[PDB]
Amino acid sequence: NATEIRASVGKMINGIGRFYIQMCTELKLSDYEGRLIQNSLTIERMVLSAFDERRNRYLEEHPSAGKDPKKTGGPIYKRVDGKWMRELVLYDKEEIRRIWRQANNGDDATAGLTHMMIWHSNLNDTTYQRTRALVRTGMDPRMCSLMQGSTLPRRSGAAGAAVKGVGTMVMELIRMIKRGINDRNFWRGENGRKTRSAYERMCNILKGKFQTAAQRAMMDQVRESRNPGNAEIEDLIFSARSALILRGSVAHKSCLPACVYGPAVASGYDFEKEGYSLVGIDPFKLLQNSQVYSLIRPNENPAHKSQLVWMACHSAAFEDLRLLSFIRGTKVSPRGKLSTRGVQIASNENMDTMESSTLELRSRYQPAFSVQRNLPFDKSTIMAMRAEIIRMMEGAKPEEVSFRGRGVFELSDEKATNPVVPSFDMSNEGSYFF
Amino acid sequence: NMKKTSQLKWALGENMAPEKVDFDNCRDISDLKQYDSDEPELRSLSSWIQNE
Amino acid sequence: YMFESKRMKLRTQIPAEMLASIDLKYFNESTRKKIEKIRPLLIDGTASLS
RNA sequence: UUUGUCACCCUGCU
RNA sequence: AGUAGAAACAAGGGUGUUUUUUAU
Numbered sequence: 374n375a376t377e378i379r380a381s382v383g384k385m386i387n388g389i390g391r392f393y394i395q396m397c398t399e400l401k402l403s404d405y406e407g408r409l410i411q412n413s414l415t416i417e418r419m420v421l422s423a424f425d426e427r428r429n430r431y432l433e434e435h436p437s438a439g440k441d442p443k444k445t446g447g448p449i450y451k452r453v454d455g456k457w458m459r460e461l462v463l464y465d466k467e468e469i470r471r472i473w474r475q476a477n478n479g480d481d482a483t484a485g486l487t488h489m490m491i492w493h494s495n496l497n498d499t500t501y502q503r504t505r506a507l508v509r510t511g512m513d514p515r516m517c518s519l520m521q522g523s524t525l526p527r528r529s530g531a532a533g534a535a536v537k538g539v540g541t542m543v544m545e546l547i548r549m550i551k552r553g554i555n556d557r558n559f560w561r562g563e564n565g566r567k568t569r570s571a572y573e574r575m576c577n578i579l580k581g582k583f584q585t586a587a588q589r590a591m592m593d594q595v596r597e598s599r600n601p602g603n604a605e606i607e608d609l610i611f612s613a614r615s616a617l618i619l620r621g622s623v624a625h626k627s628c629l630p631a632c633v634y635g636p637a638v639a640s641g642y643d644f645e646k647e648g649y650s651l652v653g654i655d656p657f658k659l660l661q662n663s664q665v666y667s668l669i670r671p672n673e674n675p676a677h678k679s680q681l682v683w684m685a686c687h688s689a690a691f692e693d694l695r696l697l698s699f700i701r702g703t704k705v706s707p708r709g710k711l712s713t714r715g716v717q718i719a720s721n722e723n724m725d726t727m728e729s730s731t732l733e734l735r736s737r738y739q740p741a742f743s744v745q746r747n748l749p750f751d752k753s754t755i756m757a758m759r760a761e762i763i764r765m766m767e768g769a770k771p772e773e774v775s776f777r778g779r780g781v782f783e784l785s786d787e788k789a790t791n792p793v794v795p796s797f798d799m800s801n802e803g804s805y806f807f
Numbered sequence: 808n809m810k811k812t813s814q815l816k817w818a819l820g821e822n823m824a825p826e827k828v829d830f831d832n833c834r835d836i837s838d839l840k841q842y843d844s845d846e847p848e849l850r851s852l853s854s855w856i857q858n859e
Numbered sequence: 860y861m862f863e864s865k866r867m868k869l870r871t872q873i874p875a876e877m878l879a880s881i882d883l884k885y886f887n888e889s890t891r892k893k894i895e896k897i898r899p900l901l902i903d904g905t906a907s908l909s
Numbered sequence: 910u911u912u913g914u915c916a917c918c919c920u921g922c923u
Numbered sequence: 924a925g926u927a928g929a930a931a932c933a934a935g936g937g938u939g940u941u942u943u944u945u946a947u
Binding site for chain 5: 414415418421422432436437438439440445447448493497500501502503504505708709713714715716717718719720721806
Binding site: 562600 | 810811816826
């Protein structure tokens with residue numbers, strides 16, 4: 374079972390790599406581009422727009438502004454002789470249909486679709502701060518490191534449960550019901566079937582997410598509620614503070630983009646023979662031994678842009694620096710402390726001043742030797758199963774995020790023999806979002 | 808003003824009137840028929856009405 | 860008249876103009892035996908009453 | 910579920 | 924559920940706004 378699953382994963386890896394390869398060859402790119410993150414992301418985008426039914430529908434409707442219908446493309450970069458040049462073409466979609474095809478033995482591959490799109494999604498996570506979103510919903514600020522799957526597509530039957538952090542689900546549910554207030558037909562409609570279906574799966578999976586016998590029943594109650602409303606809302610938000618105190622079973626893992634699948638293939642390796650472990654050492658190794666190009670504007674340290682790339686390409690979810698900077702040879706500096714504006718480039722600003730650089734994608738590495746960490750002693754703000762959750766809050770060990778995934782030991786320690794006792798420098802902050 | 812909780816809407820009958828849609832759409836559905844217009848259920852006398 | 864579906868919670872209104880063409884699988888016995896006796900008089904919504 | 914993130918009015922015999 | 928009894932109520936109408944964007 375698990376063996377076959379790993380085999381299929383490796384096969385999808387191989388497929389994504391081929392795909393990148395073919396795309397490159399056709400566009401008429403060269404080695405550099407094979408390791409050009411920007412163009413890689415452009416291609417990924419393109420393919421994603423491509424495999425979407427709702428997308429197809431809307432477009433066929435009235436595409437209007439934008440590239441021509443049935444085809445599309447992205448800002449694709451290329452130095453001329455001296456400076457880089459940013460173009461844009463609406464690649465025909467049949468081409469894309471056939472490229473995925475050959476790349477995947479004629480077998481559709483949404484599994485890796487989601488793998489890589491998760492990738493770009495968490496990357497955007499390392500880069501942006503959706504503070505407003507929160508209150509925009511009314512949730513009120515929750516300084517948290519979860520909600521990794523907050524900005525991802527709809528279809529992750531499994532990946533969503535894997536990465537969508539309690540916060541994501543809570544926020545979704547808030548809007549869900551919320552629209553079930555602003556709107557009345559959500560239930561006052563034949564659509565009711567689909568609607569309840571959704572509410573229900575969510576309930577179940579989110580309640581299961583955390584691990585507090587107490588709230589679990591509360592969530593059961595919230596679900597059994599029909600015609601949901603505000604009370605449900607207050608319930609959920611507290612419980613989410615309570616989650617701030619309780620681990621979301623949802624566990625983030627690790628990502629690899631086509632750019633990287635691409636030379637992994639163009640270089641020489643058997644992916645279908647050995648599936649790359651998104652929670653093991655294989656991807657780590659491939660990356661450490663992989664070249665990469667990131668275009669960078671002035672006033673942006675290459676050590677800081679590489680750090681930003683690191684978290685996003687390690688599924689950090691704004692993880693704790695107490696190990697993040699360990700796990701990697703160098704010191705990981707806080708978000709507000711880095712000179713960078715993300716990875717994506719806008720169209721509004723100068724392009725001549727684009728220094729390309731090579732991305733530093735490498736890493737040096739409760740009875741258990743690892744010591745889970747919580748820093749929540751703001752009972753005051755917590756105050757700001759009533760007594761059950763209260764007491765459980767009073768004197769207990771909480772946790773923002775548990776990166777039990779990604780066994781990262783000593784990179785020479787390939788299957789976790791010598792857990793090197795961790796040395797955390799308590800001087801620096803623990804949360805990426807501080 | 809009482810907060811609105813589950814049991815209170817249940818008892819007070821909130822969100823329970825059927826939706827108003829046209830005949831052009833739900834014309835091919837089953838169990839679609841008139842409102843009931845039957846005689847009420849028959850009953851016989853008791854003893855408490857005189858005592859009251 | 861007003862029709863209701865108990866299984867999907869739908870209520871709808873039909874006007875008196877459809878009482879010469881509508882399918883008769885929607886009414887109880889009294890309404891059926893009234894419609895099928897008034898039907899030889901319906902002219903554009905009205906009904907001949909001499 | 911949805912291409913959505915949130916708002917806005919009106920009416921109580923028409 | 925309940926009102927209610929030969930058919931209904933458990934509210935009914937319009938107005939919005941929309942190709943990936945770096946952060947608090």
